[PDB]
DNA sequence: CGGTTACGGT
């Protein structure tokens, strides 16, 4: 394995990535994370700083990749993750949604078949520092 | 195998 920037990430791969938590959604059926590393990728959505009343505060454009998490990954995960954490996601999986847009999903696995993983990483480690460093161009 | 659209703020 091997880590990507998400500006290098396609659909329908397994990939590894660190990324800084931008949003997270709970719901009766998964949890979301809206997550970025301050690098472009073209299949991303293009957040709008126009939209009246949205909580979102940045990173603006295509920087952002929704992560959908199901079910073990759901329960851990849901009052834990938080909002501006760092975490690192490790061999997730990837696909195009109907308007073609990038997304990063994480099924239930039991069968321990694909070694998925997802934890927070402190803020001072050093892995994190070209996140930091690009956010510093945003802002 | 789910769930839909960049909000909502549960």
Known sequence: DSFSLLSQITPHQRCSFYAQ???TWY??????????????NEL???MSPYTSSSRWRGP???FSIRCILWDEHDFYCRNYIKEGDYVVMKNVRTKIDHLGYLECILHGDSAKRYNMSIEKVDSEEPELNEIKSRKRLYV
């Open 27 to 40: 719901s009766d059926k998964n949890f979301t994370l809206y997550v970025t590393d301050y690098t472009e």
């Open 60 to 62: 603006f454009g295509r």
């Open 21 to 23: 938590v931008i949003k």
């Open 44 to 46: 991303f959505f293009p």
